[PDB]
RNA sequence: AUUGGGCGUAAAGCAAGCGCAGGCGGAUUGAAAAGUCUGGUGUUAAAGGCAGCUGCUUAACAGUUGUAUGCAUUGGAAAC
RNA sequence: GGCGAAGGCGAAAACUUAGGCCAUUACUGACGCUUAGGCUUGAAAGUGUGGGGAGCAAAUAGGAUUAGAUACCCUAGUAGUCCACACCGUAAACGAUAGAUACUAGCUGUCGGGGCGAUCCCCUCGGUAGUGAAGUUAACACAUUAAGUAUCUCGCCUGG
RNA sequence: GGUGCAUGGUUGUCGUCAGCUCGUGUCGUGAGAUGUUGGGUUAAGUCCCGCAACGAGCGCAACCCUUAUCGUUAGUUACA
């Protein structure tokens, strides 16, 4: 685990006089091999907020496979009027991505990839789009299985 | 036999046009009443799957849980079966958020255990009011977790009388990968339920016959004395 | 707007720091203006000793100050160096009319007295170290003594301006409205170059049902 | 499913 | 936002109808191939873009060879 | 609720008369959707003329209210409100969803047509609603009459 | 001497008012909601029933004094 936070925010709620101050932070954790855990948590205290965020991240673990450090198929994730592209590229281009996008691409243990954000650039919506793009990823063996001919073609 | 076609006398019956459409594949067309019937063959194979999987979990020595909260009939049946064999159960309504977390449940049931064992230790030393309210709290704890005290861990298997009537229970069950078996009447979602037994609950005779068969299935696997093993004869129990 | 919970519950379950009686306002003013100076001298001049308390027991031109601390060595010192000096200041501030005597005694589980814990917390805060972690290990090490929930409030500067961000923690069952719960309270002041910070702590040592009356 | 034995 | 945008409540469906041109057009056969795929020929100045070679103490720089683009002709191709 | 593309259409009688639905297993044989321009119709109000004018009621007059009322309360009442002749084209001319088009759970209905029976009530074909699965969206919600899947054509928009 | 717009501490305020929060957990893109909502019952979020919520923290009551009927130990300088 690396448990590197991605986005932090401060927010208040209104009541009868004054505003109660419960800030929220979003964290992403990986294994450098494919496990991904994302979680946002709000709390009165910063260390307790980190504790709850880690709890949520550890409770939302899921692993994804890789193909020579990249994803072989050109696919786009669409979520909340925001799209993220992902496109294979040889070892001579290196990783190229935005900050939070870099956090995702690194924490999952991935490598060189072509990703450009589309739509709005709010952090959480874009993060959701990243997971959405991850989900519909398919593997050559399984798409071969659904074909009557099984030769990875 | 088991799930005999001629053994049963009332398996059909349901309010029409209140059913989820994709449940029509397991039902044959209606004749006159439009009260949802059931193809007894697929019922037989579903019960056979339940029978072999409960034997399998018996070999694994897995924990069994009975979940049912209908008005009186299946409630009385589950209470009798639960006081007959070791199984978790509930009579009160399903508490919101029970299966999803057991740590709070663990500490609460430990509190229940320490209080009841202190009552056992106590010899009416406490005054009338003190032990009066203590016994009231004990009875409240019996109302809450008096049916789920027989386990300290996650429930290895659980039956649902009706996922629609127990939407909270099946929703919690969907969160975890634990095996869940239910009784789809005519209007449930197959993807939520793991193993499907499309039996009826609109009539009490069907419910009693099926629960008797499943209780015998889960009892005889543990090599305890049973009631029905492979006998086509059955006990007739009409609702009061 | 509240009150110090120590004095609210004081004198009914806990006892006094100075127990004495004399003639009505004839010379009692002398004793009651003499004793407080000595006690706060003991608090401020002797920090490392972690003194739990000092009892003043006076009757007709005599004084019996009994100290109760955690480290008698510091108040004694190497080759009993500190005892001669401390006797010097006390007899210079107690007068020749009263006899002098002093000895150190301990008490079972002294780590659950509010005053020494508050003083230790204030001393730790005065080191310009992140406050929250300091209170975190403080609460951990006071709960490790096998007690109930604890209350703490620290009001003062936090990295400069924005005084409106005072910090406090509530733990466990800490009923101050009751009277028979074996509850003590303490308060201390720390002085930085930016201002004065007040710390207040409520220590709970288990509810003490069927206590009866005061000792 | 059915892989619990 | 031709590739590559939207138009229910953030801005955008004309108040609606008739309708030329134009835009898009149901199934099959024959003809040809205008477009299109595509062989070939000529053109697409040099230099300069990318790649390679030589001269530079490395280097910008010079020279050097190929590389692409569209156009006309012509030969197949008949799915649209 | 019915009609139509709508605005709108409600005492009745007649003449004229459009458009609309189902089976069409009788006929031409793609004769089809869109629509620049162009043409047409089109709430109320308004424009000028000839009438009619009970009441209503712009404007205006008086009386009340309040710090005050050219408002709101009342009393009145000119134009206008209706008929015919020509112009008039702004309305939230909102289903805020352009037109046509095939398909995608369903349930409760309503209405018309066909078969057949006493109503009852079965389905078929459409209009008309409510609910709701999938799907959509930012949600509201929509959801076999989509704002869904997609297509064709116009018209429009690119911060205030 | 000036700085309660540098502070601690202190006091009044809503108010002797029942309301105010957290852990877990659920739903939701999310601010957040769900307990604390509803119905009986109380000075009262007092308890109870239902309740995707289960529990916990402050306060409410409790434990402090007094008034009260009477009993006990002791009796003066109260008494008599």
Considering all nucleic acid strands, name the nucleotide whose C1' atom is nearest to the C-alpha of residue C1. Answer: G11
The answer to whether residues C154 and C135 touch, using CB atoms and an 8 Å cutoff, is: yes
Residues C92 and C174 in one domain: no
**Domain extent for C129:** 109-215
Q: What is the distance between the alpha carbons of residues B204 and B211, in angstroms, rounded to a whole number? A: 10
Describe chain C by its helix, strand, coil percentages, rounded to 5. Answer: 35, 20, 50
Structure-determination technique: cryo-EM
From C127's Cα to the closest Cα of chain A, the distance in A is 21
B57–D1 C-beta distance less than 8 A:
no
Residue where one domain finishes, among candidates C108, C141, C169: C108
Chain D: residue whose CA lies nearest to B196 = D1
**C75 within a domain of the structure (yes/no):** yes
Residues C75 and C114 in one domain: no
**C4 within a domain of the structure (yes/no):** no
Residues C93 and C182 in one domain: no
Chain D: residue whose CA lies nearest to B177 = D1
Residues C94 and C119 in one domain: no
Among C47, C213, C40, C21, which Cα is nearest to C120's? Answer: C47
**C6 within a domain of the structure (yes/no):** no
Residues C92 and C143 in one domain: no
The answer to whether residues B99 and B172 touch, using CB atoms and an 8 Å cutoff, is: yes
Strands B157-160 and B180-182: parallel
Residue where one domain finishes, among candidates C57, C84, C108: C108
The answer to whether residues B137 and B115 touch, using CB atoms and an 8 Å cutoff, is: yes
Strand F–CB A78 distance below 7 A: yes
Distance of CA C22 to the CA centre of its chain: 26
Long-range residue pairs from B199-203, CB within 8 A, at least 24 positions apart, any chain? B199/B11, B199/B38, B199/B43, B199/B46, B200/B11, B200/B12, B200/B13, B200/B14, B200/B36, B200/B38, B201/B70, B201/B74, B201/B161, B201/B162, B202/B13, B202/B14, B202/B15, B202/B35, B203/B10, B203/B11, B203/B13
Among B205, B208, B233, which Cα is nearest to B10's? Answer: B205
**C10 within a domain of the structure (yes/no):** no
**C46 within a domain of the structure (yes/no):** yes
Q: Which residue is nearest to nucleotide G65 (CA to C1')?
A: C12
The answer to whether residues C163 and C195 touch, using CB atoms and an 8 Å cutoff, is: no
| Helix or strand (DSSP H, E) at A71 | none
Residue C129: partners with Cβ closer than 8 Å, 6 or more residues away: none
The token pair that represents B22 in the structure block: 């994709």
Residues C103 and C195 in one domain: no
- Resolution value (Å, 1 decimal): 6.7
Residues C99 and C155 in one domain: no
**C93 within a domain of the structure (yes/no):** yes
Strands A35-43 and A23-30: antiparallel
CB-CB: which of D1, D2, D4 is closest to B60? D4
- DSSP for chain B? --S-TTT-S------TT-S-GGGGTTSPPP-SS------HHHHHHHHHHHHHHHHHHHHTT--EEEE---SSHHHHHHHHHHHHSS-B--SSPPPTTSTT--HHHHHHHHHHHHHHHHHHH--S-S-HHHHHHHHHHHHHHHHHHSSS-S-SS--SEEEES-TTTTHHHHHHHHHS-S-EEE---SS--TTT-SEE-----SSHHHHHHHHHHHHHHHHHTTT---S-SS-S--------
Residues C127 and C63 in one domain: no
Strand F–CB B18 distance below 7 A: yes
CB-CB: which of B59, B62, B179 is closest to D1? B179
Strand F–CB A81 distance below 7 A: yes
Q: What is the distance between the alpha carbons of residues C4 and C8, in angstroms, rounded to a whole number? A: 7
Residues of chain A contacting residue C159, judged by C-beta atoms under 8 Å apart: none
Strand F–CB B21 distance below 7 A: yes
Q: What is the distance between the alpha carbons of residues C199 and C195, in angstroms, rounded to a whole number? A: 13
Q: How far is the CA of B21 from the C1' of F134 (A)?
A: 12
Q: What is the distance between the alpha carbons of residues C161 and B1, in angstroms, rounded to a whole number? A: 84
Q: What is the distance between the alpha carbons of residues A141 and A152, in angstroms, rounded to a whole number? A: 7
According to DSSP, residue C154 is labeled E
Among B88, B81, B45, B47, which Cα is nearest to B64's? Answer: B88
**C7 within a domain of the structure (yes/no):** no
**C126 within a domain of the structure (yes/no):** yes
Residues C118 and C104 in one domain: no
Query: Environment class of residue A23 by beta-carbon count within 10 Å: exposed (0-12), middle (13-18) or buried (19+)?
Result: middle
Residues C198 and C211 in one domain: yes
Residues C85 and C142 in one domain: no
From A54's Cα to the closest Cα of chain C, the distance in A is 19
Q: What's the number of domains chain C is made of? A: 2
Among B205, B225, B207, which Cα is nearest to B216's? Answer: B225
Residue where one domain finishes, among candidates C61, C86, C108: C108
Residues C176 and C200 in one domain: yes
Strand F–CB A120 distance below 7 A: no
How many Cβ atoms are within 10 Å of A6's Cβ, its own excluded? 20
How many Cβ atoms are within 10 Å of A73's Cβ, its own excluded? 15
């Amino acid at each position: 685990f690396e448990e590197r936070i991605v986005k932090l925010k401060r927010i208040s709620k209104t009541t009868k006089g004054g505003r109660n101050m419960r800030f929220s932070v979003l964290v992403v954790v990986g294994n450098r091999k494919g496990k991904i855990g994302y979680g946002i948590a709000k709390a009165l205290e910063v260390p307790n907020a980190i504790k709850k965020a880690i709890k949520a991240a550890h409770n939302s673990l899921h692993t994804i496979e890789i193909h020579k450090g990249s994803i072989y198929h050109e696919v786009i994730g669409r979520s909340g009027a925001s799209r993220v592209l992902l496109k294979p590229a040889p070892q001579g281009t290196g990783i190229i991505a935005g900050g939070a996008i870099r956090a995702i691409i690194e924490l999952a243990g991935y490598s060189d990839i072509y990703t450009k954000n589309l739509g709005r650039n709010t952090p959480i919506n874009m993060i959701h789009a990243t997971m959405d793009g991850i989900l519909k990823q398919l593997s050559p063996r399984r798409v071969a299985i659904l074909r009557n001919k099984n030769l990875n073609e | 036999s088991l799930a005999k076609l001629g053994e049963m006398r009332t398996h059909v019956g349901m309010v029409k046009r209140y059913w989820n459409p994709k449940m029509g594949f397991f039902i044959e067309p209606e004749r006159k009443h439009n009260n949802d019937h059931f193809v007894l063959e697929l019922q037989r194979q579903s019960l056979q799957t339940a029978y072999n999987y409960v034997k399998e979990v018996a070999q694994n020595n897995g924990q069994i849980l009975f979940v049912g909260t209908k008005n009186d009939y299946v409630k009385k049946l589950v209470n009798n079966i639960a006081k007959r064999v070791d199984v978790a159960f509930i009579t009160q309504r399903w508490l919101g958020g029970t299966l999803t977390n057991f740590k709070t449940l663990s500490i609460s049931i430990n509190k229940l255990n320490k209080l009841v064992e202190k009552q056992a230790e106590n010899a009416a030393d406490l005054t009338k009011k003190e032990n009066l309210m203590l016994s009231r709290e004990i009875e409240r704890l019996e109302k809450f977790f008096g049916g789920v005290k027989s386990l300290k861990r996650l429930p290895n298997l659980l039956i649902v009388d009706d996922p629609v009537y127990e939407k909270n229970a099946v929703a919690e069950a969907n969160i975890l990968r634990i095996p869940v078996v239910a009784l789809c009447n005519t209007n449930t979602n197959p993807e939520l339920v793991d193993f499907i037994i499309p039996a009826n609950n609109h009539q009490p005779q069907s419910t009693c016959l099926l629960m008797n068969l499943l209780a015998d299935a889960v009892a005889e696997a543990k090599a305890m004395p049973t009631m029905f093993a492979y006998k086509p004869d059955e006990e007739i129990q009409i609702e009061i | 707007q509240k009150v110090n919970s120590n004095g609210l519950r004081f004198g009914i379950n806990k006892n006094w720091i100075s127990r004495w009686t004399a003639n009505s306002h004839a010379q009692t003013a002398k004793w009651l203006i003499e004793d407080e100076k000595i006690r706060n001298l003991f608090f401020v001049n002797y920090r490392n000793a972690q003194v739990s308390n000092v009892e003043i027991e006076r009757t007709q031109a005599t004084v019996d100050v009994f100290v109760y601390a955690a480290q008698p060595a510091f108040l004694i010192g190497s080759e009993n160096k500190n005892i001669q000096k401390i006797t010097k200041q006390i007899k210079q501030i107690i007068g020749r009319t009263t006899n002098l005597d002093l000895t150190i005694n301990e008490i079972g589980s002294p780590m659950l007295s509010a005053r020494i814990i508050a003083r230790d917390l204030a001393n730790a805060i005065e080191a310009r170290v992140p406050l929250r972690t300091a209170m975190r290990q403080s609460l951990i090490k006071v709960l490790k003594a096998g007690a109930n929930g604890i209350k703490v409030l620290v009001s003062g500067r936090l990295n400069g301006a924005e005084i409106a961000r005072d910090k406090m923690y509530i733990e466990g069952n800490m009923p101050l409205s009751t009277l028979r719960a074996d509850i003590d309270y303490a308060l201390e002041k720390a002085q930085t170059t930016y201002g004065v910070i007040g710390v207040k702590v409520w220590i709970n040592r288990g509810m003490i049902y069927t206590k009866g009356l005061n000792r | 499913m059915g892989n619990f034995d």
